[PDB]
């Protein structure tokens, strides 16, 4: 009799599963961003469809309606603060013009690759998963962190994670011990 815990699924599979154009576009996106499967594309498409539905039934509402003003301004503020929507496109017909790779650009994996420090997208994903990147002072090991605009200057190496100093890792430690006991004396 405990109060129920609400859950919800955050992706939706396409209605027509075998068509060549959508499949090749999905593989294009997965190759250029370095994705594990198609579920990331489905997740972005699902939440973008949610955003587009909200924008549509606010644009159907009459102008100067207080609900339209409040929800539209909140939606534009949120999608600028995330960083997907540009600074010069703060309108509703312009948030209807959003695309999937615009959302996929703002991932931590793509943002840690594009800011140097990774030299590849798959190297960026491997570098993130192995707990090497901290936003501010918080270590993040998730490729889909969706970096804000205000923290773009804070993606750096962790205070842990030997690429940022602080006591090099296990393989180098074992190699140093091997060279010390064998080539030392």
């Amino acid at each position: 009799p405990r109060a129920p815990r609400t859950y919800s699924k955050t992706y939706s599979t396409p209605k027509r599963p075998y068509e060549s154009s959508r499949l090749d576009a999905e593989l294009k996106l997965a190759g250029e961003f370095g994705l594990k499967n198609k579920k990331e594309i489905y997740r972005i498409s699902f939440q973008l469809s949610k955003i587009r539905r909200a924008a549509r039934d606010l644009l159907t509402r009459d102008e100067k309606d207080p609900k339209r003003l409040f929800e539209g301004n909140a939606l534009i503020r949120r999608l600028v603060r995330v960083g997907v929507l540009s600074e010069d496109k703060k309108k509703l017909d312009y948030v209807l013009a959003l695309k999937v790779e615009d959302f996929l650009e703002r991932r931590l994996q793509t943002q840690v690759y594009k800011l140097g420090l990774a030299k590849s997208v798959h190297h960026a994903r491997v570098l993130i998963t192995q707990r090497h990147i901290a936003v501010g002072k918080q270590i993040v090991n998730i490729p889909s962190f969706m970096v804000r605009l205000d923290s773009e200057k804070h993606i750096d190496f962790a205070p842990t994670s030997p690429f940022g100093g602080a006591r090099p890792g296990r393989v180098a430690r074992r190699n140093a011990a091997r060279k010390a006991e064998a080539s030392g004396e």
Partner: protein, 38 residues
């Protein structure tokens, strides 16, 4: 028979991207996906 194992997960998708369109390997002019003895 035994073969070197195929990569699993994300790298496999990466492989397909490398297989499909970076330096496209095998085409008959109309982008065949499964050739035999040419």
């Amino acid at each position: 028979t035994e073969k070197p194992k195929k990569p699993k997960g994300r790298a496999y998708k990466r492989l397909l991207y490398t297989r499909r369109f970076v330096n496209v390997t095998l085409v008959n002019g109309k982008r065949r996906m499964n050739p035999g003895p040419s």
